[PDB]
Amino acid sequence: MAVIADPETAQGFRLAGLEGYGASSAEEAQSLLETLVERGGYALVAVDEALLPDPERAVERLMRGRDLPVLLPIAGLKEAFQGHDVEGYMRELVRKTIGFDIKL
Amino acid sequence: PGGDMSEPVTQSTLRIVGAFWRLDASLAFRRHFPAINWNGSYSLFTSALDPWYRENVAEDYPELRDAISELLQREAGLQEIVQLVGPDALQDAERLVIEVGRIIREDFLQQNAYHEVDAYCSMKKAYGIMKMILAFYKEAEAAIKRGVSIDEILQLPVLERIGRARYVSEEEFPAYFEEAMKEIQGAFKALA
Amino acid sequence: PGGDMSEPVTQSTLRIVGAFWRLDASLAFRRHFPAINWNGSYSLFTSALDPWYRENVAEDYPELRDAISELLQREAGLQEIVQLVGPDALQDAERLVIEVGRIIREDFLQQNAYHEVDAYCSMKKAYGIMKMILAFYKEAEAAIKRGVSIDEILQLPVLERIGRARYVSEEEFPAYFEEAMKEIQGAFKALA
Amino acid sequence: PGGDMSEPVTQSTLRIVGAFWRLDASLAFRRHFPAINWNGSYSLFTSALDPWYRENVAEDYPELRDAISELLQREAGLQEIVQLVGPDALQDAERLVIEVGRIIREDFLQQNAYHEVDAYCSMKKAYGIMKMILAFYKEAEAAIKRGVSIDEILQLPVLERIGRARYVSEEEFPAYFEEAMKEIQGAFKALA
Amino acid sequence: DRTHPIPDLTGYITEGQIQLSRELHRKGIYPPIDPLPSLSRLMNNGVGKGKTREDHKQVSDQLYSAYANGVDIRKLVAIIGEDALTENDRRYLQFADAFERFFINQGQQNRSIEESLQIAWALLSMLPQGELKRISKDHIGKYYGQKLEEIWGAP
Amino acid sequence: NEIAAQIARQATVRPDLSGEGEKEEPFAVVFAAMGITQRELSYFIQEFERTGALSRSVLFLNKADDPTIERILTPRMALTVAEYLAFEHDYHVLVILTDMTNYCEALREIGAAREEIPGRRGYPGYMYTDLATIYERAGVVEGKKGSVTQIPILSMPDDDRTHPIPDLTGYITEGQIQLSRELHRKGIYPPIDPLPSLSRLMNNGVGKGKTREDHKQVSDQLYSAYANGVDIRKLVAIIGEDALTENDRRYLQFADAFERFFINQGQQNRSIEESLQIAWALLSMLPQGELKRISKDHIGKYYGQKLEEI
Amino acid sequence: DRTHPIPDLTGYITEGQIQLSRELHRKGIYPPIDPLPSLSRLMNNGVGKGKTREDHKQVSDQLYSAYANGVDIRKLVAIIGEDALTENDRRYLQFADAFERFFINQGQQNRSIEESLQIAWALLSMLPQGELKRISKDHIGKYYGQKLEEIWG
Amino acid sequence: VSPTRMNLLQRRGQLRLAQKGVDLLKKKRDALVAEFFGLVREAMEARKALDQAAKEAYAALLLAQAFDGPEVVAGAALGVPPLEGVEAEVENVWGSKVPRLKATFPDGALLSPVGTPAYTLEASRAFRRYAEALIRVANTETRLKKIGEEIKKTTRRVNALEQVVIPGIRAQIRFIQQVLEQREREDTFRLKRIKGKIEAREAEEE
């Protein structure tokens, strides 16, 4: 597997055995993710949401062709210390997945 | 022959009659009586009778009736989602429309013919019940905007007051009506 | 005229005859003969001939015939879903029914008038082929309940024996049939 | 009557005429004129007029015409798929075919009888428009293989040049044509 | 074709219809009477208290609804399999087959109305009490609970 | 009937745009009713009384209780009076023939009685000529100042446009205005569907020196945009809104705004200037490059007004 | 319309018919002969060992079966979609396309029965040898295998 | 489609089959929606667990470099290799294959996570558990997306049937009915004409 996030957390991810990487910019994150996916290899790639909220949307040109890489929006660090709205994330996910954009 | 409205007799009739009261067995299966479908029925007398209503019933009766019709249309426009997912998954406003449609149906469109008092209704009584329901709708919409829980709006005794309006005798409807309008006014202010 | 079976002649015949062997243009276009429309054909003589079949073919011939008929009706029922969602969308048991219906169509109901052997079939040869197909169906159903893929069932070579039964001469057929009845049990035992 | 082509007059005519210019009400509803159904029309003179075309229009005119017909046939095939599963579900090659088929419809097949220039079109002008469309298609296919996005191709400015080519006059059309042919390569080199 | 003039006019004049089915016939069931497209227009005036039994009308309505649900679920299983079904869907699936085998398929038997009502209650007992919406609770209490063995030995 | 009464009330000729500059004259109305019910007759009489036009009108009233074979004389007498007025006294007449379906039903009754060779659904084989003898009594004559305009009203049986009555009428008349049951159920008045509606004489009456120069192109562009919008709406009903490209989403919004602001106008009288203003406002919803039916000059002159019309 | 009285009575009188198809004609296939609705009543009289070749009738039967399967899968793709097809279904699609483009489309060329049977066997070799159930295994051994590219391209 | 009585009856049967298929597919979508919402609840739980783990692991890492040298933490991360800690086994859901990542995750494959640092080893434990929770979240998300696109496919099929196929069959039925009725009318007119002419001939000359 592997992960892309801020360098502050990538060190810990590697400390756990994941091929971590440091993302300095949203463009940098997208380029690195494209390089990671284009290269044949690891199966899971969690992407920091703050730098790229919708990795599948951005990498649409590849994931539509290959289905092994499992992208994943992972929570940011400074956000984690203050929390984030999971319910809103799931509402957006439902909108994306069934399109009918309604929940309660 | 088999309900095909394209039959020549039906088509010739519909060229000459001013009202089409479409009965449907689907409603009667759902225990809804009279079994008249408000989506397929129509009338060509409403505009010519409006001046009569504005003097014999009330000046705003045409507007209230049009409002009831628009509410029913809004309900019919939300059956493509209520079918896919139950009423519970709809947001506050759409579920409010669904419940307003339910109350319209069950407390204004239904009428027991074997009941001692419900078998008959006057134009004043119908106008009163329409005004009841529409005023409740306005207040419930305002409350939802004020962040009230829709479930709380679905538990108010005022709804049970509106439900029994069908069975109140004509000599007793006016007092019931004024009291229930005042209770509607004072039922959402009480609810936070 | 036109292949229309609603013509006066065909309909008047349909009311006085005992057996009705309807022919299908779709099957004749594919060169599948005899090309009988199974769904649209019938006989009124089956119940009267059962004693003869028990005495002169096999004691359980009527039951096997009825089992074949039930299989064909089940395939006709599932063909609607197949036309709706395609054959791969079906569950394992339903695909097995479709496949065994196809085996019946191609290995039992198909007959080559211009062949030296298949141009004629005795009642006992028909009973043997029917028994083969039914035994295969039962063992395949048991296998599927124990978790054997359909793809692995349809590749079993005993199906080729079942498919070539039609061509075995009348004198050689009994030995062929005993070998095949042993082989079916062997093949579905070996699958484990 | 009713646009039905199975009537005695149309059927009796179709046995004797050498061309069948079939008008379509669906095209006329969308203000697509001349409103000729290119899928349902035919001509039995195309083979005999090829020698005249090859010396009076261009030596390769029939090949361009055949290519445009093939593109239209491919569009007709793809439209049935698109209308049920959405344009996005297609591959990039098929999407380009849909777009070029639309360009052919709107920029070549459509003609304005009430316009001061588009009312009449010469054979050279038709050949030029076809050559521009086919050149754009070849460059676009190359670009698709080079990974270019369909959106980039569609947003090009040369498309406007092709789209206004029919309103240009005869006395100045060949200059417009040379310029646009240069611009097509120029634009598809820009995308790289 | 029910739209053929003979059956159309007959339906115009008559008061219902008993429809035979070729699917039931070719599955071995006799008499091959299909309840779903069958109707007796005057049934309600000749059943009930003082004629037949008080539980007749609701038992008929419940049988109709349960059988229709069972047939629909039978088509649904072919696609989504039995595991994806809920327990109630499975009970309806079993009830439909039992209905075809023991209710429709009586062969050359002569069943009095009491025997038929007993069989109907035995079949309805397969469904969980309280899923029988169209039957009053009194009749459920009085007749619910019969065992299929009473008819299992004579399909 | 409401649309016919509104047209009769609001019909004007606008000499200011044409250039003659002379003061207009009002329309005489000849009104022929065949098989008309009392409800509809009451509506028409009340409308004409309300607008004061009942003094400058001639009414021939064959009611649904009147003899059927007399239904064949009514339009002929109406048109005799219309032509007399127009081409002998220099009037501008507006003829309204309500329920020509009743005329065709009467014609079929007679034809069946006489056992003549029928056509498509029992209607006599000469129905086309008979309808032409009524419809081709409109027009304008050289050396005459008056005119006869016809607005027949026919109810299409079973909403079927291929039925012989609408079919033969459309082969004779100069276009048609087709109402939409769908628009009516959405609450739109007047519920005129543009796509099945056509006017064949529009080009000889619009443009330079009549209306203003962008009329024809604006109409063509509206047709193209609405056709695309309806196609995209068909696509959406299958593959959901969320999958639409942004351009297609624009076309959808255009279709909706069209139906809700252009078609729907209630009982309002809109001059050609206001209608063209609303039209350009709706067209401004699209990217300026997708307006292929309009020349650059007009786009420059008029593109860019928002829907702030009040 | 094949149900029109003229074709209908003719077919009831004549010993087969060669029915053209507008769908093939529009695709550019000449002669646009649609094999499924065509028929030759007396064909069995004049084919086989000692007349044309011993594999003729079975090869014709196999071609009919394969083409019918192809047309059915064409009707199937409109419902399921191409990506859901099985490998055998895809193979029958390819067979139908190649059949139309190479066996039916021949232009103004004169083919001997030997060349026609060679093209038929080349097309049948595109299907797995176990799917050819109408042909005897002797003929499958003797004639199966050859590739279409050898004939053209 | 040739106008015949047989074609009309076949076309009516096709209409009935299309309607039955619409109902069947609606029931299929009902079951899919129920399962989908169950998976939505599960995913809410999994995401909340992942968020809590992210909080705790970020905390532990922050203190690890705060007490153990940031260079020490960097060296520990560098030493640990990108071990092959998962097996990408696939799972079948409603006729579709989806990954089900299994965390084989050999602990011994982490080289030099312990030593001179006193807490960096613990921070590795927090991030390993965090990776476990992240795997669980991925497992739930893939299933939810697959069931969602199955719902979308079914809805597209239903809409196709209800808005393209069924209206087409109805139009064909109407057309065939019109053609057949017209033919009957024409034949009747012919018979009446012939019989009338024969009657006139008998009157004129017997």
How far is Cα C116 from Cα B136, in angstroms, rounded to an integer? Answer: 88
User: What are the residue ranges spanned by the domains of chain H?
Assistant: 1-206
CA distance to E44, E150, H62, per residue, from E52 (Å): 11, 21, 83
Cβ-contact H151, A98 below 8 angstroms:
yes
How far is Cα F12 from Cα F26, in angstroms, rounded to an integer? Answer: 8
DSSP lists the bridge partners of residue F61 as: F33
**Burial tier of G144 (Cβ tally within 10 Å: 0-12, 13-18, 19+):** middle
DSSP lists the bridge partners of residue E43 as: none
- For residue E60, the one-letter residue type is S
Distance from CA of G75 to the nearest CA of H (A): 14
User: What are the residue ranges spanned by the domains of chain F?
Assistant: 1-303
The answer to whether chain F touches chain B by having 3 or more C-beta pairs less than 8 angstroms apart is yes
How far is Cα C173 from Cα C121, in angstroms, rounded to an integer? Answer: 11
Distance from CA of H95 to the nearest CA of E (A): 9
The contacts of residue F237 (CB under 8 Å, 6+ apart) are H159, H163
Query: First vs last Cα of chain D: how many Å apart?
Result: 55
How far is Cα E19 from Cα E7, in angstroms, rounded to an integer? Answer: 11
Residue of H nearest to F163 (CA): H178
**Burial tier of F249 (Cβ tally within 10 Å: 0-12, 13-18, 19+):** middle
Q: Output b/e per residue, C139-177; b: 16+ Cβ within 10 A.
A: bbbebbeeebebeebeebebbebbbebbebeeeebeebb
CA triple C74-C75-C78, angle to 5 deg:
90
**Nearest residue to H98 (alpha-carbon basis) of H111, H89, H107, H106:** H89
Provide the 8-state DSSP code for F204: G
Token digits of residue G150? 């050898």
CA triple B136-B140-B143, angle to 5 deg:
140
HEC assignment per residue over chain H: CCCCHHHHHHHHHHHHHHHHHHHHHHHHHHHHHHHHHHHHHHHHHHHHHHHHHHHHHHHHHHHHHHHCCHHHHHHHHHHCCCCCCCEEEEEEECCEEEEEEECCCCHHHCCCCCCCCCCHHHHHHHHHHHHHHHHHHHHHHHHHHHHHHHHHHHHHHHHHHHHHHHHHHHHHHHHHHHHHHHHHHHHHHHHHHHHHHHHHHHHHHC
CA distance to A94, F44, G48, per residue, from F50 (Å): 58, 10, 93
Task: Compute φ and ψ for F295, nearest 5 degrees.
Answer: -70, 165
Residue with tokens 């044309």: G52
Token digits of residue A51? 């730098």
Cβ-contact G94, G126 below 8 angstroms:
yes
How far is Cα H51 from Cα A76, in angstroms, rounded to an integer? Answer: 10
CA neighbours closer than 13 Å in the CB half-sphere of residue D74: 17
Cβ-contact G36, G71 below 8 angstroms:
yes
Please name the helix (run of DSSP H) or strand (run of DSSP E) that holds residue B76, with its range, or none. Answer: helix B61-76
CA distance to B133, C161, H14, H157, H164, per residue, from H168 (Å): 42, 46, 11, 15, 6
Please name the helix (run of DSSP H) or strand (run of DSSP E) that holds residue D8, with its range, or none. Answer: helix D8-14
Out of E1, E76, E80, whose CB is closest to H9?
E1
Provide the 8-state DSSP code for F155: P
Cβ-contact G3, H4 below 8 angstroms:
yes
Distance from CA of B103 to the nearest CA of A (A): 22
- For residue F186, the one-letter residue type is K
Token digits of residue F165? 């009555």
Cβ-contact F168, F143 below 8 angstroms:
no
Interface of B with F in 3-22 (CB under 8 A): 6, 11, 15-16, 18
How far is Cα H206 from Cα H199, in angstroms, rounded to an integer? Answer: 9
How far is Cα D28 from Cα F175, in angstroms, rounded to an integer? Answer: 12
DSSP lists the bridge partners of residue H88 as: H101
How far is Cα F70 from Cα B172, in angstroms, rounded to an integer? Answer: 57
Resolution in A: 2.5
CA triple F223-F226-F227, angle to 5 deg:
85
Residue with tokens 């050609």: F272
Cβ-contact H55, H106 below 8 angstroms:
no
Other beta carbons within 10 Å of A69: 24
How far is Cα A47 from Cα A2, in angstroms, rounded to an integer? Answer: 9
Cβ-contact F28, F287 below 8 angstroms:
no
Provide the 8-state DSSP code for D21: -
Provide the 8-state DSSP code for A52: -
How far is Cα B69 from Cα B42, in angstroms, rounded to an integer? Answer: 12
Cβ-contact F169, F176 below 8 angstroms:
yes
DSSP letters for E59-97: HHHHHHHHHHHHHHHHHHHHHHTTTTS-HHHHHHHHHHH
Alpha-carbon Rg of chain D, whole angstroms? 18
Task: Compute φ and ψ for F37, nearest 5 degrees.
Answer: -85, 160
CA F206, F211, F214, F219 dihedral sign is negative
Cβ-contact H166, H18 below 8 angstroms:
yes
Q: Output b/e per residue, F113-123; b: 16+ Cβ within 10 A.
A: eeeeebbbeeb
The contacts of residue B126 (CB under 8 Å, 6+ apart) are B108
Cβ-contact H161, H22 below 8 angstroms:
yes
Distance from CA of E59 to the nearest CA of B (A): 17
Token digits of residue D97? 């075919």
Most F CBs within 10 Å, among D9, D31, D103, D105, to test the F interface: D31
How far is Cα C6 from Cα B112, in angstroms, rounded to an integer? Answer: 49
How far is Cα B145 from Cα B141, in angstroms, rounded to an integer? Answer: 6
How far is Cα D78 from Cα D81, in angstroms, rounded to an integer? Answer: 5
How far is Cα F30 from Cα F34, in angstroms, rounded to an integer? Answer: 13
Instruction: Please list every residue in chain F whose beta carbon sits closer than 8 Å to the beta carbon of residue D86.
Output: 235, 238-239, 243
The contacts of residue D89 (CB under 8 Å, 6+ apart) are none
How far is Cα C4 from Cα B181, in angstroms, rounded to an integer? Answer: 69
CB contact under 8 A, H156 and D83: no
Helix (H, G, I), strand (E, B) or coil at F34: strand
How far is Cα F134 from Cα F156, in angstroms, rounded to an integer? Answer: 19
Token digits of residue E30? 């006799």
CB contact under 8 A, F195 and D83: no
Alpha-carbon Rg of chain H, whole angstroms? 37
Distance from CA of D99 to the nearest CA of H (A): 23
E-strand stretches of A10-49? 19-22, 44-48
Give start and end residues of each alpha helix (H) in chain C.
8-14, 25-29, 46-56, 61-85, 92-104, 123-145, 150-154, 158-164, 173-190
Alpha-carbon Rg of chain G, whole angstroms? 17
Helix (H, G, I), strand (E, B) or coil at E51: strand
Cβ-contact G62, G134 below 8 angstroms:
yes
How far is Cα B33 from Cα B24, in angstroms, rounded to an integer? Answer: 10
Cβ-contact H143, H93 below 8 angstroms:
yes
Helix (H, G, I), strand (E, B) or coil at E117: helix
The contacts of residue C91 (CB under 8 Å, 6+ apart) are E77, E78, E79, E80, E81
Distance from CA of B28 to the nearest CA of A (A): 32
CB contact under 8 A, C29 and G37: yes
Helix (H, G, I), strand (E, B) or coil at G119: helix
How far is Cα F229 from Cα F283, in angstroms, rounded to an integer? Answer: 12
The contacts of residue E48 (CB under 8 Å, 6+ apart) are E54, E56, E57
Cβ-contact G46, G39 below 8 angstroms:
no
Taking any CB pair shorter than 8 Å as contact, residues of chain C touching chain H are 2-6, 80-81, 83-84, 88-89
DSSP letters for C100-112: HHHHHIIIII---
Alpha-carbon Rg of chain E, whole angstroms? 17
Helix (H, G, I), strand (E, B) or coil at F59: strand
CA distance to F206, F223, F250, per residue, from F301 (Å): 18, 20, 22
How far is Cα C75 from Cα C82, in angstroms, rounded to an integer? Answer: 10
Token digits of residue C74? 């089940």
Residue count (chain D): 192
Provide the 8-state DSSP code for B105: I
How far is Cα B63 from Cα G79, in angstroms, rounded to an integer? Answer: 49
CA distance to C147, G28, G104, H102, H170, per residue, from G31 (Å): 51, 9, 7, 60, 36
Instruction: Please list every residue in chain D whose beta carbon sits closer than 8 Å to the beta carbon of residue G26.
Output: 39, 73
CB contact under 8 A, A44 and H101: yes
Token digits of residue B156? 């108010």
Cβ-contact F72, F110 below 8 angstroms:
yes
How far is Cα B132 from Cα D174, in angstroms, rounded to an integer? Answer: 76
Query: First vs last Cα of chain G: how many Å apart?
Result: 39
In chain C, what is the greatest distance between 2 CA atoms, to the nearest angstrom?
58
The contacts of residue E123 (CB under 8 Å, 6+ apart) are E63, E95, E98, E99, E102, E103, E148
Torsion of CA H22, H27, H30, H34, to 10 degrees: -160
**Nearest residue to D108 (alpha-carbon basis) of D134, D78, D129, D123:** D129
Cβ-contact F303, F284 below 8 angstroms:
yes
CA triple D88-D93-D95, angle to 5 deg:
35
CA distance to D13, D23, F83, F127, G69, per residue, from D9 (Å): 6, 15, 36, 18, 39
CB contact under 8 A, D83 and H164: yes
CA distance to A63, A72, D120, per residue, from A32 (Å): 15, 15, 58
Query: Contacts by B170-175 with C-beta closer than 8 Å and gap 24+?
Result: B170/B117, B170/B120, B170/B122, B170/B125, B173/B124, B173/B125, B173/B128, B174/B124, B174/B128
Most D CBs within 10 Å, among H2, H152, H156, H163, to test the D interface: H156
Instruction: Please list every residue in chain E whose beta carbon sits closer than 8 Å to the beta carbon of residue B1.
Output: 3, 8
Cβ-contact C115, C161 below 8 angstroms:
no
How far is Cα B5 from Cα B2, in angstroms, rounded to an integer? Answer: 9
**Burial tier of D192 (Cβ tally within 10 Å: 0-12, 13-18, 19+):** exposed
Cβ-contact C190, C157 below 8 angstroms:
no
How far is Cα C166 from Cα A76, in angstroms, rounded to an integer? Answer: 72
DSSP letters for F96-142: EEE-HHHHHHHHHHHHHHHT--B-SSS-BTTHHHHHHHHHTT-B--T
Token digits of residue A93? 């996910």
The answer to whether chain A touches chain E by having 3 or more C-beta pairs less than 8 angstroms apart is no
Taking any CB pair shorter than 8 Å as contact, residues of chain C touching chain E are 66, 69-70, 72-73, 77-78, 81, 85, 89-91, 94
Cβ-contact C78, C94 below 8 angstroms:
yes
Please name the helix (run of DSSP H) or strand (run of DSSP E) that holds residue C20, with its range, or none. Answer: strand C19-20
How far is Cα H116 from Cα H69, in angstroms, rounded to an integer? Answer: 10
